[PDB]
């Protein structure tokens, strides 16, 4: 049961995958976004992910299919485990901290190229201890908010 607000957010997410703007997500487009953030799914794995969401079996995900799967499968909140996995992806050297560079890396690959001041403001919003980086607990707060 999605609100206008949620639809707008999902449209933006769908659009990142749908890089050619044709209103469908292919295996290729899904693979591209995944690899761009450090995932290494095999082709068969990608194909399964598509087939899972592709209700009409025509081989691509369209927006109605995407929204329907969101309404059927999404959680109310980001789960604890999803937050731990996402922290891993941001903290790609595994040093325990998300740095401005690691944050910029993720944001650019989510289709948002930010200035240094904007990256720094993002960090500032999360940065409880004022050290200039986002640790695990600070990241949890930003994800549960």
């Amino acid at each position: 049961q999605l609100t206008e607000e949620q639809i707008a957010e999902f449209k933006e997410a769908f659009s990142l995958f749908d890089k050619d703007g044709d209103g469908t997500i292919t295996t290729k487009e899904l693979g591209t976004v995944m690899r761009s953030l450090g995932q290494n799914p095999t082709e068969a794995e990608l194909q399964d992910m598509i087939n899972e969401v592709d209700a009409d079996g025509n081989g691509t995900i369209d927006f109605p299919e995407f929204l329907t799967m969101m309404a059927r499968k999404m959680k109310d909140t980001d789960s604890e485990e999803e937050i731990r996995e996402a922290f891993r992806v941001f903290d790609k050297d595994g040093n325990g901290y998300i740095s401005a560079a690691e944050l910029r890396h993720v944001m650019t690959n989510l289709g948002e190229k930010l200035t240094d001041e904007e990256v720094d403001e993002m960090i500032r919003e999360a940065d409880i201890d004022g050290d200039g980086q986002v640790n695990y607990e600070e990241f949890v707060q930003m994800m549960t908010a």
Binding site: E9, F10, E12, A13, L16, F17, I25, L30, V33, M34, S36, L37, Q39, M49, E52, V53, M69, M70, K73, M74, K75, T77, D78, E82, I83, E85, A86, V89, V106, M107, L110, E112, L114, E118, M122, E125, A126, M142, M143, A145
Partner: peptide
């Protein structure tokens, strides 16, 4: 804001790139 976009991408079932 920008954090919201991360929240949305993290909570995508099936195809989230953050698994």
């Amino acid at each position: 804001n920008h954090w919201q976009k991360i929240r949305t991408m993290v909570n995508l079932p099936v195809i989230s790139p953050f698994k």
